Amino acid sequence: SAKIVKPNGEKPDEFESGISQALLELEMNSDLKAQLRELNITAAKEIEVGGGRKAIIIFVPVPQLKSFQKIQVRLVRELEKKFSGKHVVFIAQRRILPKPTRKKNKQKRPRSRTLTAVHDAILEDLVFPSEIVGKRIRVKLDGSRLIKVHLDKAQQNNVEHKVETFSGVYKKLTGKDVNFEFPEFQ
Amino acid sequence: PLAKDLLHPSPEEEKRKHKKKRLVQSPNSYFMDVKCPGCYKITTVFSHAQTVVLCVGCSTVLCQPTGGKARLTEGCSFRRKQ
Amino acid sequence: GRMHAPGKGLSQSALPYRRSVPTWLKLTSDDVKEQIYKLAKKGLTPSQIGVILRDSHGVAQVRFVTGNKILRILKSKGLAPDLPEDLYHLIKKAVAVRKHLERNRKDKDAKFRLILIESRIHRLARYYKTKRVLPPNWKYESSTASALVA
Amino acid sequence: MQNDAGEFVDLYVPRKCSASNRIIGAKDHASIQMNVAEVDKVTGRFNGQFKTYAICGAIRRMGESDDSILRLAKADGIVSKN
Amino acid sequence: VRMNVLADALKSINNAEKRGKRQVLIRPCSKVIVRFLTVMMKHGYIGEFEIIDDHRAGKIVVNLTGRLNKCGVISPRFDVQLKDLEKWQNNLLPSRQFGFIVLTTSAGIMDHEEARRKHTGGKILGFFF
């Protein structure tokens, strides 16, 4: 509801009349001072998983995505307190550059910002509190493939309900379905 | 043994192979916390050390590098971390 | 296979899967770079920079902390050496063989080894003269090879 | 074998091994076809019908027929379920 | 020293299907050999196979069905035109009823029958039946 926490590269700001206001308002969390004063978010999508189970996502400028990791668990709790019945994830706006081809002086596309490295880097901030300890992409007998992501179970104690909204938000943003598994320690 | 499901091995069989050759490879190294006797300073020394690790204030020798896995000098306080 | 011995040895390091810094390493990118800027000025070389901050500092791999390699951050403001570290040690080891071979003329074994090391120098020198790490007129002269190594 | 007329033009359809899925030949004289007779649930006696398994001689001579016949009794509701 | 990675993988499948095994382990993964294997899985020779993602080159575990006769490779990637393709078929196929010489075109890694339903002669990449 204000132009401070939510900028863009462009003018449009639909569906942030309570979203950017949701983190203007809050008081006395751990790291209150170095968060409300200078950091910012970019955009938000309100997509669906399952049935009537909405999930607001936050698009983040990349150099301060690292500054959202050290306060994320003490930001998920407040944003889910205010927005009840709702899940909160943090995904960077990462800006795909197209694969060059036969068809001015464009210097070359860094592989940090390629389509393979983006659709991978979308996961390890999607599952922030559990990192990824394996990946077992498996083709489903008909050309359709399926990604099995193994999370660590050393921080299992928060990611139990978010796993089916993890696959739904990964399907809308990327286009490919996953499912998550919790294998034993090695 | 025509039907070993060689995508899901048991972790016991996973431990008793090479550090290469595994289904996903993973090293047999670890990091260990070592209290030298007589100081507050926890050391975070690597297991397969190659250097002679010295302590900062009470500057006695902590471990000895040897063949595979470093032998600690004194019987000392010691734990495997992470 | 091993290049100049018929060996089939499989013993080399295996990075783990997780690229992340562990939760106990409270040691920042600013601190590990300035440690590397300190003790590489104490005459140390990029293969032995990472070994002492693995053993006594817990930093598992500098690329997993800084996002950059060890020799890459030495060249970041110029205090990296002129010859590469691996070309330096073959040249240093070949001088030790050649000085040995002068007093020991009828050591026909070291005469066989001397061309195997010196072949590995020139095969690796032709790599760096294509990556423009070395100038194109750079030639391994055995006469001035003892002046390249200190 | 279903020509474009739609007719079966074939002397016989040979069996195939339930382990190695390959064809038992006409004179593979080590290929067994044996029956495993299931029981009823409540009293455990022979109820009349059975289940057949053909194990070809090439996979029988190799020596893991027992690994075979247990594995297809594991999958087909007979042995242990653990 | 692995000069061809499709040649090593498809040698490895061939030894275990005649050995009787239900799974193989293919140590390097490639984008040419996952598009190679979903030409024989689609025609119905192998089943579910998984790509094991590692940060270096991944592995592949293939579930063998038993319907495979031989899955070789034509090791120099020769060029084959659609005029020239018919004399490639009668050399290295057991019949004109079945089996596929799988060849990479500008429009994708295809069959030989997909290559002439399109008009897309290419480079021969391997064969399987």
Side-chain angles (χ1 to χ4, degrees), chain E residues 32-90:
Chain E
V32 71
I33 65 174
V34 298
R35 293 179 65 90
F36 195 87
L37 265 62
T38 63
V39 168
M40 62 180 74
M41 184 185 73
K42 291 179 98 288
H43 283 282
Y45 289 1
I46 55 174
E48 299 277 332
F49 67 95
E50 307 89 3
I51 298 173
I52 294 163
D53 185 79
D54 203 283
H55 291 168
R56 77 277 303 153
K59 295 174 183 177
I60 298 171
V61 172
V62 185
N63 292 317
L64 292 171
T65 57
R67 278 92 68 86
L68 185 62
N69 292 321
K70 190 168 179 178
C71 55
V73 62
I74 298 301
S75 180
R77 291 177 181 174
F78 292 109
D79 183 76
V80 48
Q81 300 182 359
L82 293 175
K83 181 179 184 293
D84 205 0
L85 180 59
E86 289 82 2
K87 58 189 286 292
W88 281 95
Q89 293 194 5
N90 55 4

Side-chain angles (χ1 to χ4, degrees), chain D residues 1-10:
Chain D
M1 49 85 72
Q2 279 296 111
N3 55 357
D4 203 0
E7 302 292 327
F8 287 170
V9 274
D10 197 358

